[PDB]
Amino acid sequence: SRKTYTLTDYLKNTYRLKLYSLRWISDHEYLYKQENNILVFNAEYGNSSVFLENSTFDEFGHSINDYSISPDGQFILLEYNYVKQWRHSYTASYDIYDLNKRQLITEERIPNNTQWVTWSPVGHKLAYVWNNDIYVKIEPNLPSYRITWTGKEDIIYNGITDWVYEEEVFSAYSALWWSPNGTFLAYAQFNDTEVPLIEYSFYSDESLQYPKTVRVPYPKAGAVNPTVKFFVVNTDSLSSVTNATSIQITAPASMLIGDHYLCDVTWATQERISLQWLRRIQNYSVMDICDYDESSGRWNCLVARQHIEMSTTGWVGRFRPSEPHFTLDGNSFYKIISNEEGYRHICYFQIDKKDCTFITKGTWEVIGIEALTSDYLYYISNEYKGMPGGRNLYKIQLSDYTKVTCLSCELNPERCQYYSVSFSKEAKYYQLRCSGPGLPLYTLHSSVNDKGLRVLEDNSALDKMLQNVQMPSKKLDFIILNETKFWYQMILPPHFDKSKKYPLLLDVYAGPCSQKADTVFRLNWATYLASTENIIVASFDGRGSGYQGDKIMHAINRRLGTFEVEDQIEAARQFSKMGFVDNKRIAIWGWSYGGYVTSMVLGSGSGVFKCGIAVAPVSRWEYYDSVYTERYMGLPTPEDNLDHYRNSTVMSRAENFKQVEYLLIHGTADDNVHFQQSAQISKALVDVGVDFQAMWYTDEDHGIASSTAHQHIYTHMSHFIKQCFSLP
Amino acid sequence: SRKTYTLTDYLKNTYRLKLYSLRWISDHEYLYKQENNILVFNAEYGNSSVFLENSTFDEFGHSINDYSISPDGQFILLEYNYVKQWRHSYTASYDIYDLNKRQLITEERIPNNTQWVTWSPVGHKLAYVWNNDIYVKIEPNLPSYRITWTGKEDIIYNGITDWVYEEEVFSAYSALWWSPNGTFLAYAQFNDTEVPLIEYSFYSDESLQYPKTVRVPYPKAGAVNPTVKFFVVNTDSLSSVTNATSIQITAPASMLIGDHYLCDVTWATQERISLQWLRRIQNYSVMDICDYDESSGRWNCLVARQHIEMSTTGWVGRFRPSEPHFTLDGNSFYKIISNEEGYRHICYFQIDKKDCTFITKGTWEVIGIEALTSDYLYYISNEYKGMPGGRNLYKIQLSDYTKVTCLSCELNPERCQYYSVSFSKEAKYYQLRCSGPGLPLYTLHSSVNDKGLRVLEDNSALDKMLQNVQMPSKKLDFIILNETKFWYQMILPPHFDKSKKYPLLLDVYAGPCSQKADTVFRLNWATYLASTENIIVASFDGRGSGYQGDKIMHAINRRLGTFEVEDQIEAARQFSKMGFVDNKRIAIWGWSYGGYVTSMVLGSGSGVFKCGIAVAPVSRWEYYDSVYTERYMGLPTPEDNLDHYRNSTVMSRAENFKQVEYLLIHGTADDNVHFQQSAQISKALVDVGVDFQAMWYTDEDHGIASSTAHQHIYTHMSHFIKQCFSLP
Ligand SMILES: COc1cc2c(cc1OC)[C@@H]1C[C@H](N)[C@@H](N3C[C@@H](CF)CC3=O)CN1CC2
Ligand SMILES: COc1cc2c(cc1OC)[C@@H]1C[C@H](N)[C@@H](N3C[C@@H](CF)CC3=O)CN1CC2
Ligand SMILES: *[C@@H]1O[C@H](CO)[C@@H](O)[C@H](O)[C@H]1NC(C)=O
């Protein structure tokens, strides 16, 4: 009788999840936006005031995209004229507003087309990047100091990342790091001079008579990478008539030997910086510890205090070497490291001592370190009930490592199994964020005795509405393969009957260190497919998946397109032998890495799958970027791993596609997984005489995320699946 | 006849048409290659010998693409290493072979990557173009003379055409014209300095890591055009000590005023050249008659012999001003011109005299002048039986214009209604070739008494095969609209039955001066659809179509995407009201201009069509090239024709596509109708939420002609049409 969850509900965001995004501003207060007011909340009591009225900036004359308020809170940055670049990068204009006065600063403004801006961590200093060069304002209404003069578009990057560093290393556009004082400004310089360029057409509005050619420095597998240098400037000693001095910190000898990456920059104290470096063969990394000399005014990284992290079985880290969390005095730190068993746990390092001490252990993994006080370290793990797809906050007493308390496990075990956390400065309070299996729940807690303070957002409005709809359910469980537990989830249609045979859609990603079987609550395409179309949407975490130790994660080493493709095939045969799937209506779809696996599955000749959809897939690893590809594959040389680079293409399997119905989709302005990749798949299918379906999205990138394109692609894909499953 | 005409019959050329391509080498002999042997034929008697044995070049080491024998029979050009550029252009390598001996010439070879080669019309002088420069050899074994020193890739073209002149004007890569003596070499020079570039990706073989960007000087509508200069060089006065001297013939004062083009080049005598020029606004053209000055070494074009061809109702010529046919003495010529009533007929021009004399008249059109003697003019018209889609050879006694013989009409009237002709030098003999309605038939005749000599190829081999296949039939008729006849054709299924109702596919082109209803015999996709799938395939020649007078052809002046679209809709409507058509199953499809019309029809909201396919369509006239577009559209300025440019796009009709099923196909390496055109169509449909089907062909151009791609596109369109029509 109830209404079902329709395609229009998903596409038009009918049932919206409520959030509670706060920004901690001290040990005891946070900011929060309510009816476009910025409010300040008191954590202990819950009382709030208005930080900045909504009626302010009504007369501004531009839509304010974002704000950033100075640490010692006298000013606010007004971000406007936002223009997106890649995943993280963008460009905007900035006004500064004097909070103690009534006024906007009208003099010595931050330029338009600024690439990145940051307040110092204390006070109100400003560092920004404009035309690839760094600038510093000591006071908001005073002239900026020019730190660098070398910045050149697409060639020299000062204080910002280039394409690969942004995407694959720092996950940020920024390459600026203030010291905790704000005295020193550390920054990276990238040089792309010999990095080859990827070129593609941008069609723009119909009024553009000639297409534009977009050109991006982008190193493909085995090509010339950018080079990096690292600098630190003393911001306290700047002159308005004399160019500033930047002291270079050079990478260790064991890196300078060949191609290498800067991997991590972490300030330890007011005068000590930590730097991680990684070799182009991502087997070997080095932590440098560099102290400032008050005498010479230089930085020195003592060779004897270098920490080395290498891997025997795979690469280093999950996607990169993990970051250190330093103790207040800067002499010791904690870092997630893979133990002797291959499970990732917290190791304790002391700076002039050689090894480290493991502080956690077991057949589970630490996801992240979240806070460190003198008495406690707070971390998230998937320990609870041996479920790799669950997430919980834990707390260790530093006086006794075996004294561990779960802080979130038993708060609401039916509703809440997937937490993240946001601590205040000094971690006097924390916000817990639950994500599933039930509706998201946001709560405020106090650290002293771990008291629940206040519920912040419980999604009761959403709960009301969803009782009027035939919601699907989710099963999360595991199967055994060669004496090993591999997890899966199923999104089961309402009124699920185990004697009826249902069509199954296999939803795949399967990238290295991925997880698609978990406990989070989602409203998405699969929700629609199960609720309205009565399709089972399964996902499975095979070899190469993350969070279950290295034996599973590193099984895929030097061998992408291999075990992770077999394990999706085998999971579907498994699901077949369960009594409720129609083994004649098994489909497969995935996006990105998911597209590659879908395509590799479809060209396998398994016979299991009737049809599949690949959206923006990798087709050949030599087409993807160097930092990512080479991490899992090594180099595409006969000396190294060429043979498997050449055996793991989608193209090589073109004949086998005559046994399946295939939908290939790609955005034309994909800067990440180039349209080229699908252009080669289709060319190979034509050459072999294999009919299939295609769809390009003009001027869309990897997300195909514009409002109209997003609605279009999901509409197109639904038709294809329904016709494949003979659904009306 | 049991077995049907299949898709695989079409795709694999199961039923090959035989041809008889001969090369006249004198008044009374021709060359003809048979297997790999070049034979020489005597026209009067029929006897023949092998001119060049297939064995001759067994040990050459390259497959030869083509041959060219010098007009004196002493030497042969061997073309190999053929690489296609655009529709007509290509590069190749050339060796010369002395025939009197039996030897390859090894010194002073024609270089690799030669862009064009031509023998003089008499003897064995060679002229060639390499790296955009002209060279001349007086003797095959001797060093070549460099004529031009200004050639520059994509900038200066000497003796070859740039993209637009090749495609739109000359239909040739060549821009060289030897005089009938071989004394003078005339040539054009093109300057693309300021012409904007179309840029698109080319992905190449799988091995290519980074796609290429192809960049072509290509003026879109209203953009900066190339400039042209004309030069004549004397080939008898060349020195291997001094640089060659090129004499410039400048355009007439009435062309020099604004942008213009070189239209036509036709030598009159050993010392007289004819030149036609056209204003960028192509309703005004000027013919210049230029004579050589023996005393000064110059060329003068007197205004007394200048002729103006202009048009009040449209543009000049069918696609360009027509070529002159001069009498031997060079003092007069014949030319196809639109008469007072707007029908195209032969005018007789005397060189220093005003006006011209129409020698033909009537409500029909001369297609071409084919040969001129002292006693007779030979031309092709559609006069016979008042059928615009028929073609016959005629003969005029020049002493009395009213005395016209039809030479081909009654030769075989049920089988043969569409002729072309090839006359020998001095026209003592002619090859007639008929193309339909029956199987092609090749015959030889002598001009003395117009006696049939010999049948050359009668396709009797194909006739027997087709006897054993269920072949469709062709209906050619007309319908009346206002008070005008508009012709159509239907390919009808075998065993057609007017009491039954058939699905109907409209096959559309409908560009200006097109004819889709003719008497030609074809084996194509439509053959398969009628024979195997029992679909009627209709084509219709409405307003804008050719060979019926300017009142019909010029209807579309300044107004593309109007009447020609309207008329196709009416045609389909009329076919509905015919008792043998199922009006719930009417489709439409077209390529290039036809894809544009298909789309405009599908976007019309007429309700007549269930589905349609557009291959490589134009979507907006500002995207197509200046020379073709401005001919019909004028300039896209507010003081010219911007409003109808803006009102005739496919994109603006996007909302209307929710009422139909649409398949859109484009090759990504289309240098002619750019992928941009379909890219914009798809974006418009997405912006408006219309589902449709798509298919790109990576690296395919306007023809989508590579054997795998050709097979793949027609397979794909066959599926689309079959499911649109509910055909199993
Ligand atoms: C936790 O931090 C990270 C998480 C993740 C990543 C990087 C991180 O930081 C380095 C990478 C970056 C990579 N570019 C992305 N891929 C794979 C490509 C298809 F094979 C297409 C594409 O966009 C996959 N994600 C997976 C999740
Ligand atoms: C008889 O000589 C000619 C015959 C023809 C033409 C030119 C001639 O002389 C130069 C033109 C040239 C034009 N480029 C071509 N189109 C139209 C475009 C679609 F809008 C895409 C495309 O390729 C259509 N053809 C039709 C036949
Ligand atoms: C909360 O209330 C206290 C006591 O009235 C007040 O001093 C404080 O400013 C309040 N905090 C906020 C954020 O309004």
Swiss-Prot record, chains A, B:
Consequence of changing N191A: Does not inhibit dipeptidyl peptidase activity, interaction with ADA and homodimer formation
Outcome, altering E168L: Inhibits dipeptidyl peptidase activity
Organism (species): Homo sapiens (Human)
Name under which the protein is recorded: Dipeptidyl peptidase 4
Induction comment: Up-regulated by IL12/interleukin-12 on activated T-cells. IL12-activated cells expressed enhanced levels of DPP4 but not mRNAs. Down-regulated by TNF. Up-regulated in migratory endothelial cells and in the invasive endothelial cells in tumors. Induced by hypoxia.
Name of the coding gene: DPP4
Tissue expression summary: Expressed specifically in lymphatic vessels but not in blood vessels in the skin, small intestine, esophagus, ovary, breast and prostate glands. Not detected in lymphatic vessels in the lung, kidney, uterus, liver and stomach (at protein level). Expressed in the poorly differentiated crypt cells of the small intestine as well as in the mature villous cells. Expressed at very low levels in the colon.
Quaternary structure note: Monomer. Homodimer. Heterodimer with Seprase (FAP). Requires homodimerization for optimal dipeptidyl peptidase activity and T-cell costimulation. Found in a membrane raft complex, at least composed of BCL10, CARD11, DPP4 and IKBKB. Associates with collagen. Interacts with PTPRC; the interaction is enhanced in an interleukin-12-dependent manner in activated lymphocytes. Interacts (via extracellular domain) with ADA; does not inhibit its dipeptidyl peptidase activity. Interacts with CAV1 (via the N-terminus); the interaction is direct. (Microbial infection) Interacts with MERS coronavirus/MERS-CoV spike protein.
Miscellaneous note of the record: Level of plasma concentrations of the soluble form (SDPP) can be managed as a colon carcinoma diagnostic and prognostic marker.
Residue intervals annotated with topology Extracellular: 1-728
Chief location of this protein within or outside the cell: membrane
Effect of N112A: Does not inhibit dipeptidyl peptidase activity, interaction with ADA and homodimer formation
Consequence when changing N482A: Does not inhibit dipeptidyl peptidase activity, interaction with ADA and homodimer formation
Record-level GO cellular component terms: apical plasma membrane; cell surface; endocytic vesicle; extracellular exosome; extracellular region; focal adhesion; intercellular canaliculus; lamellipodium
Top-rank lineage group of the source organism: Eukaryota
Annotated phenotype, changing N243A: Does not inhibit dipeptidyl peptidase activity, interaction with ADA and homodimer formation
Effect ascribed to mutating H712E: Inhibits strongly homodimerization, dipeptidyl peptidase activity, interaction with CARD11 and T-cell costimulation activity
Positions of disulphide bridges: C290-C301, C347-C356, C406-C409, C416-C434, C611-C724
Nucleus recorded as keyword: no
UniProt-annotated catalytic positions: S592 (charge relay system), D670 (charge relay system), H702 (charge relay system)
